[PDB]
Amino acid sequence: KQFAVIGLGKFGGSICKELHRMGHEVLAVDINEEKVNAYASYATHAVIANATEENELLSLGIRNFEYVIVAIGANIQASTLTTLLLKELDIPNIWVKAQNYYHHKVLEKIGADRIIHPEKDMGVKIAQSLSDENVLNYIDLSDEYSIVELLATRKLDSKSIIDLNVRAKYGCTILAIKHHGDICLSPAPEDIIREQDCLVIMGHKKDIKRFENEGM
Amino acid sequence: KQFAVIGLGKFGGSICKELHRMGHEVLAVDINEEKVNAYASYATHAVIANATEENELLSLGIRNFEYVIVAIGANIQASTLTTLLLKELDIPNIWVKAQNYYHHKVLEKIGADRIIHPEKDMGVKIAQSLSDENVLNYIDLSDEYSIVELLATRKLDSKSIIDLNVRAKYGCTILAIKHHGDICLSPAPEDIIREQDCLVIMGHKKDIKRFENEGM
Amino acid sequence: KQFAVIGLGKFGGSICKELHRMGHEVLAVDINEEKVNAYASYATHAVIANATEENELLSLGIRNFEYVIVAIGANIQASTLTTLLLKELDIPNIWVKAQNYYHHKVLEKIGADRIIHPEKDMGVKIAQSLSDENVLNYIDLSDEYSIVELLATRKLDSKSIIDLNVRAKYGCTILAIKHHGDICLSPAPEDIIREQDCLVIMGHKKDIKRFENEGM
Amino acid sequence: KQFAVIGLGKFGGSICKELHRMGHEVLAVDINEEKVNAYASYATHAVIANATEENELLSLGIRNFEYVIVAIGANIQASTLTTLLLKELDIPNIWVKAQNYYHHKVLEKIGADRIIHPEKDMGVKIAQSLSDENVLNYIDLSDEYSIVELLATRKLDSKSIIDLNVRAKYGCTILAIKHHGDICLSPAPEDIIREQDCLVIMGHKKDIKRFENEGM
Amino acid sequence: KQFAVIGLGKFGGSICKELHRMGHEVLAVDINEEKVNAYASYATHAVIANATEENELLSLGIRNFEYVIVAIGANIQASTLTTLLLKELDIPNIWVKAQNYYHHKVLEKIGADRIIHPEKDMGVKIAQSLSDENVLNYIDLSDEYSIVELLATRKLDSKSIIDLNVRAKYGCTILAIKHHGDICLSPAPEDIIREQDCLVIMGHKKDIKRFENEGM
Amino acid sequence: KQFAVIGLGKFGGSICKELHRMGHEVLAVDINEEKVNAYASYATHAVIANATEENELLSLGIRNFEYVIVAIGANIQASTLTTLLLKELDIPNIWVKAQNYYHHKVLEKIGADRIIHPEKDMGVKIAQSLSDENVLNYIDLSDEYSIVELLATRKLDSKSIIDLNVRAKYGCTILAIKHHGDICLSPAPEDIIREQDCLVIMGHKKDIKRFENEGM
Amino acid sequence: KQFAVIGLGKFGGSICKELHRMGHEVLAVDINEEKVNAYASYATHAVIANATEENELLSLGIRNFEYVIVAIGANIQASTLTTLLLKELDIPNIWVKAQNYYHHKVLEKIGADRIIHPEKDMGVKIAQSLSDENVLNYIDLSDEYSIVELLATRKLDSKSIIDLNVRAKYGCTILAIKHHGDICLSPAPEDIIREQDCLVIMGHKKDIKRFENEGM
Amino acid sequence: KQFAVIGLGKFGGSICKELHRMGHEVLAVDINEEKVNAYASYATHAVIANATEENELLSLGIRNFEYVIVAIGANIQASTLTTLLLKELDIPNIWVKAQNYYHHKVLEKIGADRIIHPEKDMGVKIAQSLSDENVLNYIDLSDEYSIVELLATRKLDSKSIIDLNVRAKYGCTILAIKHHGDICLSPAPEDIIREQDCLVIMGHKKDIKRFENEGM
Ligand SMILES: Nc1ncnc2c1ncn2[C@@H]1O[C@H](COP(=O)(O)OP(=O)(O)O)[C@@H](O)[C@H]1O
Ligand SMILES: Nc1ncnc2c1ncn2[C@@H]1O[C@H](COP(=O)(O)OP(=O)(O)O)[C@@H](O)[C@H]1O
Ligand SMILES: Nc1ncnc2c1ncn2[C@@H]1O[C@H](COP(=O)(O)OP(=O)(O)O)[C@@H](O)[C@H]1O
Ligand SMILES: Nc1ncnc2c1ncn2[C@@H]1O[C@H](COP(=O)(O)OP(=O)(O)O)[C@@H](O)[C@H]1O
Ligand SMILES: Nc1ncnc2c1ncn2[C@@H]1O[C@H](COP(=O)(O)OP(=O)(O)O)[C@@H](O)[C@H]1O
Ligand SMILES: Nc1ncnc2c1ncn2[C@@H]1O[C@H](COP(=O)(O)OP(=O)(O)O)[C@@H](O)[C@H]1O
Ligand SMILES: Nc1ncnc2c1ncn2[C@@H]1O[C@H](COP(=O)(O)OP(=O)(O)O)[C@@H](O)[C@H]1O
Ligand SMILES: Nc1ncnc2c1ncn2[C@@H]1O[C@H](COP(=O)(O)OP(=O)(O)O)[C@@H](O)[C@H]1O
């Protein structure tokens, strides 16, 4: 699979650097010479180009790539024009970073395959950790059920899983325990939990919160 | 708990709006009048203020708040100065959005309690989804272990959980199956999977990938 | 013919006000109540509406109009999305005011029927009037030929058309003379020109300038 | 004569670029470095300066220029303040772009020599072209008479000038024909008109419209 | 009747402080924080604000005040812009301190209701007292007539009013005599004057000087 | 008598220029060459000098002058230092313009003969005219008595002096009437007052105000 | 001896705090309540007072003190007035901190006993340490001779005093050596110097620099 | 070595003026026009610039300088912000003036190479001179030993260095005698001391003091 990342900023650069680490063919494209030089090490190839210019875009051989990521930030107009050009060149997947609701809409209309709101999405998750000091990370299975990574409190120190009757008191199941960085999966009822451990609980959203209120 | 969100941008605004939805006391603060007006519905109070001015911060009554979030983006100097002011006002928790590695370092030195990289973090997650079309979402328990939400292919159509002997062959456990919106938790070995369903697997990262290559 | 003018600014407002004077059915649409109130007198109907909202657009019954003018200025995003929305509603003629070179390109791509650059076009005309203080107004037939309205000097005072033999000496023709508001068309060779009158000459651009240098 | 253009916007930039093309000495002045860089090619000299600052204006040697154009747009205060300085320096001709009616009035009081409303003026012209799509361009001789450039229709295809007897039937005269970019001035009665040609007719406004309705 | 004093300097501060002493509603406005704190005691309300900024001016509720005094001194640009805003906001009475002759001209054109030259006026008044040691204070009724307060000399000691026939000999009338703090109004012909008393004479300027030269 | 004016500002300049009209020997002194050039016409002699420099002070022959006025403004130290220098040179009369209360105190201590507060004094007078729109000008004889110049209103239109019996009803006396610039002194009881005339009344401060409320 | 320190700033406060450590009677005086509160522990007495007010000055009984230090900083007017007042009370020693050249001059004239320029003096010393990284501290005996504390380099490691014969070669004498905190005074010719030790040399300024360039 | 001094105040200016005197390359930088103008004579180059602005700082070519001294006056934010930029530009040596204990801490954290307290340090030294009337200046070798410059009293008049048996009695050494400005270094036992001469003694602090008590 070949990847082209247009706009080597905070978002696009991270994508480029991460994709490269996984051992993928990644083309980094940026209008700023300094940006291109920086990511020369972190890309298969890095090229200075203006994505709004079709001739420059064609010069890259951009038609070859199955995934092209438009991560241009502050010039929303440049972002729009680029997406329009890429769609004209029949790029299979065009993923674009959006700046606002209106920008999301025009991208949606002009045929962006995937639209991303990095700041907006993270804002939600960080807010979850703000409201609940206990939650470290989570993943939602549905509207009602979820898997949550919790930070163990002192109330859970030296408690066993069978001691913490979570399937019966709360209808939830404990999936993992992380102790001093070492992790345990599908932990047995005899396993003990100590403070500052990572605890992975799975169940109904309301049920988990009750475990947090009463249990920890 | 009272929360103050300074800088109502894409990141800060989402935090504020989400915190407000959960029914928390949130103070929205921004130097731009237009930004403050927009989030008026989504905050307990919304105030036009310069966070770099010590006198203005006191007018807000910022000492009252347990959590103050500095989500100023493009002006690194204001972000730094604001963070610097808040520590002098002895704010318990100061969370700040960072723009680069160097900005992260100065925040760390001047006593920021939490430093966040929304664009950087999302870049990684999206890169994982770019490289592997099968993964919809994931959460990392540690460097080696993770919980992954997968999109079932036709190679997995009408296969049983005991058929996909994941607990022994790959050392991973399946946590959930989502079929037509209907959700199944901790599914039994007799349960069936149909294509384009969501599959939630838990285990070591390499083990999951092996399941992806060989199984699906 | 029905006309809809979206965005009651300097440009759009002038369009609406002038069209109304000619006795056309003109629908004035603006997001600002004050703007709508201002043009209540100068339109057939005036409505407060957000043009980026499809449901509001349908409430206007905008599909009926043969010409829709998008004159939103500072919000390039709204202009693009509105233009984009109007095309999906199959509006016959969509005229849009452009803010920059890139805005021009997206409008061209998303199917704007006519794109207008009011400032750029006036800049050209005013520059011509700057170099030649004598020219009041003009119209270009081509790159080389033009029709120009001139302000008569004392050098042309009490001069006859046959006296200023421009048809042979300069290969130019005098089309009209305006005296004290009274107008004369295709004036006879015996007709006199007085200073501070309006003089309309037609010919080659270089040839006209020769008349200005030598004649007046 | 030397020209100075303050404010390199859509209007000011166009003025400067066009004046430069005519081979005049034009000084491009703008407070934004990016604007100055852009018009460096299109000006004799380009300088970064704040026009509201008397010392910076003197550094330019602005007293030398016969014409100074203030094309600052969104900052009415800077536009006003700059204009005020120029009159103090006894600048011969001060032409200023106005943003609103009140701005027009203050400019008039403080001694602006010419006041321009680019958007407002174009609004009228575009409205004329909206009502009549046949007219390409025009110039008004008076309230009642005008010279109009028309887009020839099929009703005029392969028609001769003597065939379309406008001089007697409509009291109008045909001044020019533009065919294949090639231009014909004061055409003889035998000359033919083909569709999609430019036709320049002269007469009373009502009479021309009658020619448009009946003739084409 | 509400008063707003913009610019708390030597002049404006005195106005505000004196207006306050009479028990009027006075709003003290200054851009400097240090100035505002000082006149908090001597004003009904004192606010830190930039008077050139329309949004800050409206926050003051400046539309409410019948009289607004612009006493900004050294920044002629600020004085002008502030004055311009106030006329634009339709403030009934705008009194402005002028710095020079030209500043007087721009203020008059932009609609200042009263223009004051405190230093200029006092210079004249003090100069009169420099040239003539006898005059303590005076007031001009016209270009030619005045009322003057004189310091009685030894030549006037123990002189009666009927002795000094200023009413017939000099065409002037003595209005008052002030002796040891005790005051005499419209003194009778029998009343006596002693040296170093305050003497208030009324008449023509030339006639008073003749009384000073011949009489005193 | 010879006069030296040090510091040719708004205050000092006015003194010098006014003194010059009266035909006095005036030395204009200023550190700024441009100020000196301006007042060359308005002074007996004009010299560039630093008043804080003792050697320069002696070169002027400042010892010759009976009155030296220090009207330096923004550098309070220079004002103090010059005044301090002049007193050690035993200058007969040293008049100094003061910037604030503390500056008044040091000048008083170090032997300034007269201290002037031009802005402060005018502030008071202007405030009186602000509070009372009727008063044009005034002079105080004591704490309780004053002479006031009034602007006649319509309530005083076509009124005689005997009609407005202020001598008995208000215990005040009318001194003068000014009509269309024409002036009348010590007017007879038959004389009439019309609105927009100047009226000069003399009496107790409280009494005059009573006349203003009830009479006009 | 009793000391009075007026103005508890960086300068005055340090004086006050250090004098107290030596066990002297120190009166701390400041107009700011917070300043007085801060130095309550570090003074014999701490009093809130305005030093410019004579009645308050008498209330302190400041006439009793042999030394009064005026360390008021930002208000040059207060510093002058206070210093001026103290001389009226015939205070034996009045030491005052000066803000500029003019402030020094007036203080000199009004009888300040000692005038100090802390920033200016340190500015000189820091510049010496800036030019020469080797010098740690120094004291000037005159314009030409000095005693300097140096940081030993590797070039001086294990060198004897007789080895570095500075008394004849450079005309300088070594006064002391500091090794690992242990101190040696007037060291014998056999004593050794090691790097990173403190070295005290005495001689001509230029000669010492020659020793630094060639010797170390 | 090249030096840049930001903030031309009492401290920074003294540094700049002194470094320039030594014949060093010194860049004087200040936002105030007079300050830059004032030290123009005393610096290699002087530029008006805001040090908190990276672009203005880069225009200076600040990267060239080995030493940058931040003497911004009282805006701890400006001092902090400037210091922050210089560390980001990898400036070799960053010396900063601190305003308080807290300003010292932030400077320490953000990587100031040297932090200076001019007023505070001088306060200590001056306090030493206050307590001991004899000491003119001193330098501390350690907590217990010092080199001291004394002002000779009448008790030391016409005393010889063998007469003052300081060599044995007080364990102190006389290093220099300064007579009428002429200096004697390492003076011989026959040399005499006269009153009001400068005397440089070296030894233990308490022992030096006893010599002051008994000897002078
Ligand atoms: N026309 C263009 N062509 C190519 N790259 C561009 C163009 N315009 C901007 N960029 C690049 O996009 C990046 C801007 O991203 P940025 O504003 O940092 O957003 P974020 O930080 O959220 O990724 C910059 O690296 C810039 O070089
Ligand atoms: N000194 C300040 N005080 C308060 N708010 C500020 C200050 N400086 C900037 N801001 C606000 O912070 C916001 C930054 O948002 P933005 O950078 O767009 O977030 P993101 O980078 O996540 O999109 C801006 O809307 C701006 O108005
Ligand atoms: N979403 C929207 N829907 C309709 N009208 C809008 C919308 N957004 C802005 N406008 C209107 O467009 C106008 C823009 O005019 P302006 O840019 O000031 O003048 P011009 O563009 O003619 O130079 C504004 O008056 C505003 O009310
Ligand atoms: N104080 C100032 N001095 C000089 N140029 C200025 C000043 N303020 C604004 N400008 C310039 O005026 C220009 C305004 O252009 P713009 O408003 O975009 O075009 P238009 O007026 O046609 O809409 C900007 O390029 C800006 O740099
Ligand atoms: N934009 C502004 N808004 C409000 N006040 C201002 C503004 N600019 C200046 N000022 C104030 O105006 C005052 C000018 O006073 P000054 O020059 O001392 O006049 P005077 O000579 O009469 O004392 C200053 O105190 C300043 O704070
Ligand atoms: N040391 C000095 N010697 C002589 N004249 C000076 C000195 N310092 C300033 N001046 C002059 O004194 C005048 C000060 O007046 P200014 O500051 O305008 O106050 P104002 O306008 O209220 O009189 C200026 O013209 C200045 O050039
Ligand atoms: N009129 C006054 N009477 C007494 N103390 C004063 C007066 N004015 C100022 N001060 C004090 O003098 C101090 C000045 O110190 P500051 O200027 O902050 O630092 P520095 O001592 O370096 O100049 C202030 O702390 C203030 O409290
Ligand atoms: N951003 C800046 N860039 C350059 N110089 C500055 C800046 N901000 C302030 N300054 C200058 O720093 C100088 C130092 O102020 P001051 O209080 O005199 O300090 P000090 O007397 O201790 O040196 C001031 O003269 C001021 O003009």
Residue numbers in the entry:
A (entry chain B), B (entry chain A), C (entry chain H), D (entry chain G), E (entry chain E), F (entry chain F), ...: 7 to 222
Report text from the authors:
KtrAB is a cation channel with a nucleotide-dependent RCK domain. The structure of the KtrAB complex revealed a homodimeric membrane protein (KtrB) assembled with a cytosolic RCK octameric ring, formed by the KtrA protein. KtrA binds nucleotides, ATP or ADP. ATP binding induces the adoption of a square-conformation by the octameric ring and increased K+ flux activity through KtrAB; ADP binding results in a non-square conformation and decreased flux.
A simple indicator of ring conformation is the pair of distances (L1 and L2) separating the Cα of N38 residues located in opposite subunits across a ring face. Like in the wild-type protein, the ADP-bound R16K (at 3.0 Å resolution) and R16A (at 3.7 Å resolution) rings adopt a non-square conformation. However, the ADP-bound ring conformations are different from each other and from the wild-type, with L1/L2 distances for the wild-type of 40.7/30.7 Å and for R16K of 52.0/21.9 Å. In contrast, we found a large structural variability in the non-square structures, with four different conformational groups based on Cα N38 L1/L2 distances. This indicates that there is a single well defined square or active conformation for KtrA, while the ring in the non-active (or non-square) conformation is most likely more flexible, giving rise to different ring conformations in the crystals of isolated KtrA.
